[PDB]
Symmetry: C3
Subunit: 148 residues, 3 copies
């Protein structure tokens, strides 16, 4: 199998795919909150679900969208950086630690965001998860630059 193209690749693919699924979970929750709070973004949606007054914003829906947006600001870059990093021959354990810190940090971020946990819990989880991303980015820079 091509999953074994590099020793770190299976771990990367596991963590990344779990994170994509975690984003889908946020999308599912968003839809459920819209229905429960009757807060739809579009007049055509609202008319199907009780009337035009239900085309409206809701703080919980907005919170869900912020969590999803933050995921797009952070998880998408990881999908790129982690994939490339997997092929740079990093120490297997060190690579695992990079991926695990990101996975744990981001799952915790979503829990802290949607669960409305006190500050600075969410901020800390964001910062923690960005650390391995910064690390991988710099490593890719050096490897790319030296092969120019």
């Amino acid at each position: 199998s091509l999953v074994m193209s590099s020793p770190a690749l299976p771990a990367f693919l596991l963590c990344s795919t779990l994170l994509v699924i975690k984003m889908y979970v946020v999308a599912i929750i968003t839809g459920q909150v819209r229905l429960r709070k009757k807060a739809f973004a579009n007049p055509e949606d609202a008319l199907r679900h009780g009337g035009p007054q239900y085309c409206r914003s809701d703080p919980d829906v907005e919170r869900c969208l912020r969590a999803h947006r933050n995921d797009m600001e952070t998880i998408y870059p990881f999908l790129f950086l982690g994939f490339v990093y997997s092929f740079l021959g990093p120490n297997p354990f060190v690579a695992w630690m990079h991926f695990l810190v990101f996975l744990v940090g981001r799952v915790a971020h979503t829990v802290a965001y949607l669960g409305k946990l006190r500050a600075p819990i969410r901020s800390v989880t964001y910062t923690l998860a960005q650390l391995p991303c910064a690390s991988m980015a710099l490593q890719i820079l050096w490897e790319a630059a030296r092969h120019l």
Copy 2:
């Protein structure tokens, strides 16, 4: 050519690139709507196009942005999942079906969103397109986990 690295790869690259172009089409439409409705996000844009009163929101511009945002929530994960999936040796026809369902579902989603089609047309197209994504995600999980 490296497009033939796997039997499913050409089909994946065709569908994905068409979807990226489809997102660019949404960006183009957004710009056109801003100009036609004179609804700009920035004061510097507004002053160039008639005066400060044109720094304002517009429902059609907001709708365009929602379509583009939903694309980012769905097409970007597909770019990752579909690429990885292409190298897992899936049945060529089965892989084609995954990619085609996503392509058709997402093009239909944009038509339903921007065309303001009645509910639940847009919701159905979203759900249909997410099915092959869920399928690919699970397959990657099993392959990654078993190579740990």
Copy 3:
């Protein structure tokens, strides 16, 4: 090293990673602006930083978010297109020009956006950067289609 899988790959990886770092810079600036202007998205953040009145929108924060959103609309597609394009055996110099135009255009875009530069400076930088993306997309289409 696997960075030399294709002659254009090192240049692509350099430009892409710099652009990811440039997006992280926007995220950092956004956080700094929120703190300076005391404009937080969440009640729990506001209570930590002076009181509930600081859960509020701010034009500079909104501008930062627009720059970041536009990055997600443009840089993320480049990460995909440029990676694939690197393996299609393009002329090394021509490939470098594609990547450099995108890098320069996007850095200029962020400067023009956050610096509130007069129209049409930002619009021009956006359009300039999209040109190599359109070019790569079409090239991938032809290569993918011909291998079906």
